Amino acid sequence: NVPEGVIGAFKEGNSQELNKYLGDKVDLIIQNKSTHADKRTAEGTMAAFFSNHKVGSFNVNHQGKRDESGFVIGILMTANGNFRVNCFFRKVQNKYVIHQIRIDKTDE
Ligand SMILES: [Cl-]
Ligand SMILES: [Cl-]
Ligand SMILES: [Cl-]
Ligand SMILES: [Cl-]
């Protein structure tokens, strides 16, 4: 169910759903703050992000995958800013999991 499940999790601002797709180690870069997080910390960071930025919409404009990696790029509109989101996936145990999330506020 990748990347549909991740896209849905962002659309709903739901870190618990996102969790299901997180790798055991995730690099987060959120407003230029970088963290190399275990899964539990990554979910916690995303929970805080969604709590502080109530999601209105998430729309993807480019996605793709090869045998061992993939990506999703889109725009997240929230009640506290709009953000470009990049999710980069790696294949682990035959499943695509998130290895990096970048979130960067738009210039508006
Ligand atoms: Cl950590
Ligand atoms: Cl935050
Ligand atoms: Cl979409
Ligand atoms: Cl959409």
CA of 14 to the centre of ligand 4 (A): 16
Ligand nearest to the CA of 41: 1
The domains of the chain, with CATH numbers, are 1-108 (3.10.450.50)
Helix (H, G, I), strand (E, B) or coil at 57: strand
Distance 68 CA to ligand 2 centre (A): 30
Method used for this model? X-ray
* CA 93 – CA 99 distance, rounded (Å): 14
How much distance in Å is there from the Cα of 62 to the middle of ligand 3? 9
Q: What is the spatial distance between Cα 86 and Cα 76, in angstroms, rounded to a whole number?
A: 10
β-sheet with 95-105: strand ranges across: 33-38, 22-30, 95-105, 81-92, 69-78, 55-65
Dihedral (Cα; 74, 76, 77, 81), 10-degree rounding: -120
Nearest to 88 by CA among 14, 1, 17, 2: 2
User: Resolution in angstroms, to 1 decimal, for this deposition?
Assistant: 1.3
Neighbours of 103 (CB within 10 A): 21
